[PDB]
Amino acid sequence: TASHYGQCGGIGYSGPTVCASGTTCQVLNPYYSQCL
Ligand SMILES: *[C@H]1O[C@H](CO)[C@@H](O)[C@H](O)[C@@H]1O
Numbered sequence: 312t313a314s315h316y317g318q319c320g321g322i323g324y325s326g327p328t329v330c331a332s333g334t335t336c337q338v339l340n341p342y343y344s345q346c347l
Contacts, residue, residue, distance in 0.1 A: 319346035 312331040313319035319336035320328040321344045330336050330346040338344040 313346040315346055317346055318344060320344045 312329055313327045313334065313336060314331065315334045318324050318326070319330055319334075320338070321340070321342040323342060324344070328336065334346045336344055337347045
């Protein structure tokens, strides 16, 4: 799962896009999306 304050789903990020319970993937920039 994506981590809190970690990148959740940006362009190029092939990692876990689904956040952990209690956190939400929020796109801050097109390439940087942070799980808050
Ligand atoms: C927070 O941790 C997760 C794995 O638990 C990463 O995928 C994420 O990019 C960030 O390092």
